[PDB]
From a paper:
Indeed, LC-MS/MS analysis (data not shown) of the excised bands suggested that two unique CTL0886FL domains were present spanning residues 94–334 (CTL0886N) and residues 353–651 (CTL0886C). While equally poor diffraction was initially obtained with CTL0886C crystals, reductive methylation of surface exposed lysines enabled the growth of cubic crystals that diffracted synchrotron X-rays to 1.90 Å resolution. The structure of CTL0886C was determined using selenomethionine-labeled recombinant protein (also dimethylated) by Se-SAD and refined against the native high-resolution dataset. The final model is comprised of a single polypeptide in the asymmetric unit, 1 sulfate anion and 98 water molecules. The CTL0886C structure is comprised of 13 α-helices spanning two separate domains. Domain 1 consists of helices α1–7 arranged in a 7 helix bundle (residues 353–517). Helices α8–13 of domain 2 adopt an intertwined, globular fold with the later 3 helices (α11–13) wrapping around helices α8–10. Upon inspection of the 2Fo-Fc electron density map, four lysine residues (446, 463, 490, and 579) were modeled as dimethyl-lysine. For domain 1, each of these structures (as well as the next 10 scoring hits) are all members of the polyprenyl transferase (PTS) family. CTL0886C domain 1 is, however, lacking several α-helices typically found within the PTS family, including those involved in dimerization and extended regions typically found within the active site of PTS family enzymes (e.g., Asp-rich motifs).
In this report, we show the hypothetical protein [name], which had previously been detected in the host cell cytosol is a T3S effector and we identify a novel putative chaperone protein for this effector. Our results converge to identify [name] as a secreted protein that plays multiple and crucial roles in the initiation and support of the [name] growth cycle. In order to gain more insights into the molecular mechanism of [name] function during Chlamydia infection, we undertook a structural analysis of [name], the [name] ortholog in the strain [name] L2 434/Bu. [name] is the first chlamydial effector identified to date whose genetic disruption has such a strong impact on bacterial development in cell culture, without being fully lethal.
Numbering used by the authors: 353 to 427, 430 to 522, 531 to 589, 598 to 650
Amino acid sequence: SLLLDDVDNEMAAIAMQGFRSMIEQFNVNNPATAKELQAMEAQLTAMSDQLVGADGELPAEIQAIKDALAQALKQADGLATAMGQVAFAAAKVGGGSAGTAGTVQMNVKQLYKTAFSSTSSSSYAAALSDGYSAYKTLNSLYSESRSGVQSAISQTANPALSRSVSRSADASQRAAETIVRDSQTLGDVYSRLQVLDSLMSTIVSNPQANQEEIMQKLTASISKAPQSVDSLQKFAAQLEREFVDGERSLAESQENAFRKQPAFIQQVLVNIASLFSGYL
């Protein structure tokens, strides 16, 4: 009876290819369906057979994915819950601790829940906000994690971030429009929001810095951030024009950053959700 944290490379790649094959069975751009859930099950069984044989005992983490897919067929939360269990398993294969696999699972599951949220939902803004918190948490964890946990994160989170988006004086409103203008997917939104977040963080941490230095440092940070990079650099340059261009703009940006930064980013998220939702 096999334990996933104690697998050889051939079986690690078998498992991960099975997870990748499950992922190809759905389309995040439309509500999840019985057919997709069933197809994921068929891919899971094909990989399980390779792992332990048509009759061997399923490892705990594969058991969990099976249970999850079973429930989702009986009743969005369903596919999202199953993909969190996929990300847990993949994280365990990669040598992650229980705590790490748990964090990966909770936060990947959230990205799918955000991907499947309708823009008309009363909870859409919330879901967009929760999805950014999950994004950040995953990017933090990615950096400090073993390679296989990195693969578990990116391979399960990316499909949710691929969800398409499209649009329907105040700085937070101006930032929202700038992010949205340059974004096709949810991943585009969050990666560009993170650039703004980093711009604000750079100002706070370097209050004496002028425009050129702020941008120099931000550029370095974007180069050192976890994983298109040229596109985020180009986006940084677009933020420069809006919020760092000249002494007046910088002074405005410095007030928001020193005095309001979390509130500002959450107001930006509200305004981004408004642009996708049409609602105030």
